[PDB]
Design an enzyme around this catalytic site. Structure first.
Site, PDB file in Angstrom:
ATOM      1  N   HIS A   1       7.792  46.600  44.998  1.00 21.89           N
ATOM      2  CA  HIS A   1       8.897  47.453  44.575  1.00 21.89           C
ATOM      3  C   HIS A   1       8.513  48.927  44.734  1.00 21.89           C
ATOM      4  O   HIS A   1       9.280  49.742  45.266  1.00 21.89           O
ATOM      5  CB  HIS A   1       9.260  47.089  43.121  1.00 21.89           C
ATOM      6  CG  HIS A   1      10.343  47.938  42.521  1.00 21.89           C
ATOM      7  ND1 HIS A   1      11.592  47.451  42.192  1.00 21.89           N
ATOM      8  CD2 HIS A   1      10.346  49.245  42.153  1.00 21.89           C
ATOM      9  CE1 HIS A   1      12.319  48.431  41.674  1.00 21.89           C
ATOM     10  NE2 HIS A   1      11.580  49.528  41.623  1.00 21.89           N
ATOM     11  N   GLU A   2       7.326  49.270  44.244  1.00 20.59           N
ATOM     12  CA  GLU A   2       6.888  50.656  44.307  1.00 20.59           C
ATOM     13  C   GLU A   2       6.675  51.131  45.739  1.00 20.59           C
ATOM     14  O   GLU A   2       7.114  52.229  46.110  1.00 20.59           O
ATOM     15  CB  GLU A   2       5.635  50.892  43.468  1.00 20.59           C
ATOM     16  CG  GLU A   2       5.714  50.480  41.985  1.00 20.59           C
ATOM     17  CD  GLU A   2       6.948  50.944  41.251  1.00 20.59           C
ATOM     18  OE1 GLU A   2       7.522  51.982  41.612  1.00 20.59           O
ATOM     19  OE2 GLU A   2       7.374  50.227  40.326  1.00 20.59           O
TER      20      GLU A   2
ATOM     21  N   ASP B   1      10.900  35.004  30.502  1.00 26.96           N
ATOM     22  CA  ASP B   1      11.770  36.163  30.669  1.00 26.96           C
ATOM     23  C   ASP B   1      11.271  37.067  31.800  1.00 26.96           C
ATOM     24  O   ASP B   1      10.293  36.776  32.491  1.00 26.96           O
ATOM     25  CB  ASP B   1      11.938  36.920  29.350  1.00 26.96           C
ATOM     26  CG  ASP B   1      10.678  37.584  28.899  1.00 26.96           C
ATOM     27  OD1 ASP B   1       9.599  37.219  29.413  1.00 26.96           O
ATOM     28  OD2 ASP B   1      10.760  38.484  28.036  1.00 26.96           O
TER      29      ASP B   1
ATOM     30  N   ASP C   1      19.644  56.675  32.527  1.00 31.08           N
ATOM     31  CA  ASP C   1      18.964  56.018  33.636  1.00 31.08           C
ATOM     32  C   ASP C   1      19.455  56.538  34.987  1.00 31.08           C
ATOM     33  O   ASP C   1      19.690  55.770  35.917  1.00 31.08           O
ATOM     34  CB  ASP C   1      19.154  54.498  33.495  1.00 31.08           C
ATOM     35  CG  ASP C   1      18.439  53.681  34.553  1.00 31.08           C
ATOM     36  OD1 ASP C   1      17.306  54.042  34.960  1.00 31.08           O
ATOM     37  OD2 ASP C   1      18.995  52.628  34.931  1.00 31.08           O
TER      38      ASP C   1
ATOM     39  N   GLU D   1      17.199  51.317  44.110  1.00 29.33           N
ATOM     40  CA  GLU D   1      16.591  50.340  43.224  1.00 29.33           C
ATOM     41  C   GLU D   1      16.708  48.913  43.745  1.00 29.33           C
ATOM     42  O   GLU D   1      15.708  48.183  43.734  1.00 29.33           O
ATOM     43  CB  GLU D   1      17.196  50.454  41.819  1.00 29.33           C
ATOM     44  CG  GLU D   1      16.468  51.439  40.943  1.00 29.33           C
ATOM     45  CD  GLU D   1      15.014  51.076  40.835  1.00 29.33           C
ATOM     46  OE1 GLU D   1      14.711  49.920  40.484  1.00 29.33           O
ATOM     47  OE2 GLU D   1      14.156  51.936  41.134  1.00 29.33           O
TER      48      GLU D   1
ATOM     49  N   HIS E   1      18.859  51.438  37.466  1.00 32.89           N
ATOM     50  CA  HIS E   1      18.235  50.135  37.194  1.00 32.89           C
ATOM     51  C   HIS E   1      19.190  49.113  36.594  1.00 32.89           C
ATOM     52  O   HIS E   1      18.803  47.971  36.362  1.00 32.89           O
ATOM     53  CB  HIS E   1      17.030  50.257  36.243  1.00 32.89           C
ATOM     54  CG  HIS E   1      15.911  51.083  36.773  1.00 32.89           C
ATOM     55  ND1 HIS E   1      15.812  52.434  36.530  1.00 32.89           N
ATOM     56  CD2 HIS E   1      14.838  50.753  37.526  1.00 32.89           C
ATOM     57  CE1 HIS E   1      14.741  52.910  37.139  1.00 32.89           C
ATOM     58  NE2 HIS E   1      14.129  51.908  37.746  1.00 32.89           N
TER      59      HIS E   1
ATOM     60  N   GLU F   1       8.281  39.400  36.049  1.00 29.72           N
ATOM     61  CA  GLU F   1       7.955  38.318  35.130  1.00 29.72           C
ATOM     62  C   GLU F   1       6.461  38.132  34.866  1.00 29.72           C
ATOM     63  O   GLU F   1       6.086  37.697  33.779  1.00 29.72           O
ATOM     64  CB  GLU F   1       8.588  37.002  35.617  1.00 29.72           C
ATOM     65  CG  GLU F   1       7.942  36.421  36.871  1.00 29.72           C
ATOM     66  CD  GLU F   1       8.305  37.141  38.166  1.00 29.72           C
ATOM     67  OE1 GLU F   1       9.291  37.904  38.202  1.00 29.72           O
ATOM     68  OE2 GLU F   1       7.605  36.900  39.176  1.00 29.72           O
TER      69      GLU F   1
ATOM     70  N   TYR G   1      18.264  59.409  44.206  1.00 24.23           N
ATOM     71  CA  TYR G   1      17.968  58.552  43.050  1.00 24.23           C
ATOM     72  C   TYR G   1      18.906  58.787  41.866  1.00 24.23           C
ATOM     73  O   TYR G   1      18.483  59.052  40.745  1.00 24.23           O
ATOM     74  CB  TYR G   1      16.509  58.719  42.644  1.00 24.23           C
ATOM     75  CG  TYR G   1      15.928  57.551  41.879  1.00 24.23           C
ATOM     76  CD1 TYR G   1      15.816  56.310  42.465  1.00 24.23           C
ATOM     77  CD2 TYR G   1      15.465  57.701  40.577  1.00 24.23           C
ATOM     78  CE1 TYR G   1      15.238  55.248  41.798  1.00 24.23           C
ATOM     79  CE2 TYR G   1      14.886  56.646  39.898  1.00 24.23           C
ATOM     80  CZ  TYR G   1      14.770  55.424  40.522  1.00 24.23           C
ATOM     81  OH  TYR G   1      14.192  54.403  39.810  1.00 24.23           O
TER      82      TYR G   1
ATOM     83  N   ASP H   1       5.615  41.583  42.884  1.00 23.30           N
ATOM     84  CA  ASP H   1       6.938  42.157  43.059  1.00 23.30           C
ATOM     85  C   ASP H   1       6.997  43.606  42.612  1.00 23.30           C
ATOM     86  O   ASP H   1       7.695  44.404  43.227  1.00 23.30           O
ATOM     87  CB  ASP H   1       8.057  41.311  42.416  1.00 23.30           C
ATOM     88  CG  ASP H   1       7.846  40.965  40.943  1.00 23.30           C
ATOM     89  OD1 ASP H   1       6.875  41.401  40.304  1.00 23.30           O
ATOM     90  OD2 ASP H   1       8.729  40.240  40.411  1.00 23.30           O
TER      91      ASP H   1
ATOM     92  N   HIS I   1       9.853  51.974  47.503  1.00 19.69           N
ATOM     93  CA  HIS I   1      10.416  53.291  47.258  1.00 19.69           C
ATOM     94  C   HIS I   1       9.939  54.292  48.320  1.00 19.69           C
ATOM     95  O   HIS I   1      10.719  55.125  48.775  1.00 19.69           O
ATOM     96  CB  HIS I   1      10.062  53.794  45.862  1.00 19.69           C
ATOM     97  CG  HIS I   1      10.930  53.250  44.772  1.00 19.69           C
ATOM     98  ND1 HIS I   1      12.306  53.338  44.808  1.00 19.69           N
ATOM     99  CD2 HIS I   1      10.627  52.634  43.601  1.00 19.69           C
ATOM    100  CE1 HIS I   1      12.805  52.796  43.708  1.00 19.69           C
ATOM    101  NE2 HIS I   1      11.808  52.377  42.951  1.00 19.69           N
TER     102      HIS I   1
HETATM  103  C1  LIG Z   1       9.536  46.975  38.850  1.00 16.97           C
HETATM  104  C2  LIG Z   1       9.327  47.608  37.477  1.00 16.97           C
HETATM  105  C3  LIG Z   1       8.290  46.853  36.657  1.00 16.97           C
HETATM  106  C4  LIG Z   1       8.984  49.087  37.583  1.00 16.97           C
HETATM  107  C5  LIG Z   1      10.141  49.971  38.066  1.00 16.97           C
HETATM  108  N1  LIG Z   1       9.621  51.327  38.197  1.00 16.97           N
HETATM  109  P1  LIG Z   1      10.397  52.470  39.111  1.00 16.97           P
HETATM  110  O1  LIG Z   1       9.654  52.823  40.342  1.00 16.97           O
HETATM  111  O2  LIG Z   1      11.810  51.977  39.389  1.00 16.97           O
HETATM  112  C6  LIG Z   1      10.417  53.910  38.020  1.00 16.97           C
HETATM  113  N2  LIG Z   1      11.152  55.017  38.573  1.00 16.97           N
HETATM  114  C7  LIG Z   1      10.878  56.252  38.253  1.00 16.97           C
HETATM  115  O3  LIG Z   1       9.957  56.608  37.513  1.00 16.97           O
HETATM  116  O4  LIG Z   1      11.715  57.221  38.865  1.00 16.97           O
HETATM  117  C8  LIG Z   1      11.565  58.573  38.447  1.00 16.97           C
HETATM  118  C9  LIG Z   1      10.782  59.449  39.387  1.00 16.97           C
HETATM  119  C10 LIG Z   1       9.397  59.559  39.265  1.00 16.97           C
HETATM  120  C11 LIG Z   1       8.684  60.399  40.124  1.00 16.97           C
HETATM  121  C12 LIG Z   1       9.345  61.127  41.121  1.00 16.97           C
HETATM  122  C13 LIG Z   1      10.732  61.020  41.218  1.00 16.97           C
HETATM  123  C14 LIG Z   1      11.448  60.189  40.354  1.00 16.97           C
HETATM  124  C15 LIG Z   1      11.261  49.860  37.073  1.00 16.97           C
HETATM  125  O5  LIG Z   1      12.199  49.069  37.260  1.00 16.97           O
HETATM  126  N3  LIG Z   1      11.159  50.607  35.971  1.00 16.97           N
HETATM  127  C16 LIG Z   1      12.109  50.556  34.856  1.00 16.97           C
HETATM  128  C17 LIG Z   1      11.367  50.040  33.618  1.00 16.97           C
HETATM  129  C18 LIG Z   1      12.708  51.901  34.552  1.00 16.97           C
HETATM  130  O6  LIG Z   1      12.111  52.933  34.927  1.00 16.97           O
HETATM  131  O7  LIG Z   1      13.779  51.908  33.903  1.00 16.97           O
HETATM  132 CA   LIG Z   2       7.244  37.603  29.288  1.00 21.70          CA
HETATM  133 CA   LIG Z   3       9.320  37.939  40.686  1.00 23.05          CA
HETATM  134 CA   LIG Z   4       6.967  34.987  40.289  1.00 21.68          CA
HETATM  135 ZN   LIG Z   5      12.266  51.398  41.227  1.00 22.37          ZN
END
Ligand SMILES: CC(C)C[C@H](NP(=O)(O)CNC(=O)OCc1ccccc1)C(=O)N[C@@H](C)C(=O)O
Ligand SMILES: [Ca+2]
Ligand SMILES: [Ca+2]
Ligand SMILES: [Ca+2]
Ligand SMILES: [Zn+2]
Ligand SMILES: [Ca+2]
Length: 316
Positions: free
Chosen positions: A142-143, A200, A226, A166, A231, A190, A157, A138, A146
């Protein structure tokens, strides 16, 4: 690199064995030529210079601990490519088979992953909040999503457009997780979040409030942290998507579920045909309603359910 397509074998972050598509030219490289114009995985070597070095291995076996995040970034990028191609007839993130690049071992103790405008980037985590983040299908999806968003709707964003951005990544991350069909759920991250705590996740789509995120527009965050809560407020849209697919009664509003495939069709169409860089939540509702109308008809259950779901989360 120029070489011949090969098939290596290794172990991912969670200890599971999988085959991966590689390229041989002196070394075996994490370069999958079987998908589009390639999937390429790089070693950032605990530093922050990107992309780093195309991953090279002497024997085409990837069972070292250091290899595991690379195996999964590479393999799960392939699954995500397959999802978009097979389910939505979309060829890579740009629709024209752009090469997909990922770097792993980014920085030290790095509790995140991101799309940097050009490539995916995965930290190893600090071993407490995260283990290497490419271990989550996931997360990988997700990445990559984007990148899809950036090439299509282009949702800015921050604030509501950013929370939609998001949620789109969480929705498709989850749909790719269901597509691969290994322990699928409506939770986010997870498999790589908090190895010392079972059960969690980073976010929940089925119940965003479990991890403190809003599940109704009346509970939206409007401060500046944020990027204006991208998020956090994603929970409102994630909950709507969950309800469209699975149904439920939420703050007294009942939604008839229409299933994951139709959720994906509706949101993919919204993302690619109706959303714009500045869309807000109300405009997403309208885009989803129009998309469902296009696909299923104005009098359909699908349209009715989209409306019910947005009603349930307080978005008109
Ligand atoms: C699916 C998860 C594990 C990873 C996910 N990473 P993300 O792709 O949303 C992080 N976003 C991010 O760094 O955006 C800033 C950015 C970075 C580079 C160019 C432009 C903007 C996330 O929810 N990150 C959370 C932890 C957060 O950044 O608050
Ligand atoms: Ca865990
Ligand atoms: Ca999942
Ligand atoms: Ca799963
Ligand atoms: Zn993201
Ligand atoms: Ca090796």
């Amino acid at each position: 690199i120029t070489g011949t397509s090969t098939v290596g074998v290794g172990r991912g972050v969670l200890g599971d064995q999988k085959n991966i598509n590689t390229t041989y030219s002196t070394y075996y490289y994490l370069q999958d030529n079987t998908r589009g114009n390639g999937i390429f995985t790089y070693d950032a070597k605990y530093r922050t210079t990107l992309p780093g070095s195309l991953w090279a291995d002497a024997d085409n076996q990837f069972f070292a601990s250091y290899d595991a995040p690379a195996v999964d970034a590479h393999y799960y990028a392939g699954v995500t490519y397959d999802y978009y191609k097979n389910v939505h007839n979309r060829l890579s993130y740009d629709g024209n088979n752009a090469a997909i690049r990922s770097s792993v071992h980014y920085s030290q103790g790095y509790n995140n992953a991101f799309w940097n405008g050009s490539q995916m980037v995965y930290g190893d985590g600090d071993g407490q909040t995260f283990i290497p983040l490419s271990g989550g299908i996931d997360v990988v999806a997700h990445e990559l999503t984007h990148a899809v968003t950036d090439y299509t709707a282009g949702l800015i964003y921050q604030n509501e457009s950013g929370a939609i951005n998001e949620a789109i990544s969480d929705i498709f991350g989850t749909l790719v997780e269901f597509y691969a069909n290994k322990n699928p759920d409506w939770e986010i991250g997870e498999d790589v979040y908090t190895p010392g705590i079972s059960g969690d996740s980073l976010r929940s789509m089925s119940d965003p409030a479990k991890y403190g995120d809003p599940d109704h527009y009346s509970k939206r965050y409007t401060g500046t942290q944020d990027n204006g809560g991208v998020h956090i407020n994603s929970g409102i849209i994630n909950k709507a998507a969950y309800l469209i697919s699975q149904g439920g009664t939420h703050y007294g509003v009942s939604v008839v579920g229409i299933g994951r495939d139709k959720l994906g069709k509706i949101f993919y169409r919204a993302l690619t045909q109706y959303l714009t860089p500045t869309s807000n939540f109300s405009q997403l509702r309208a885009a989803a309603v129009q998309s469902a109308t296009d696909l299923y008809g104005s009098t359909s259950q699908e349209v009715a359910s989209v409306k019910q779901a947005f009603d349930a989360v307080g978005v008109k």
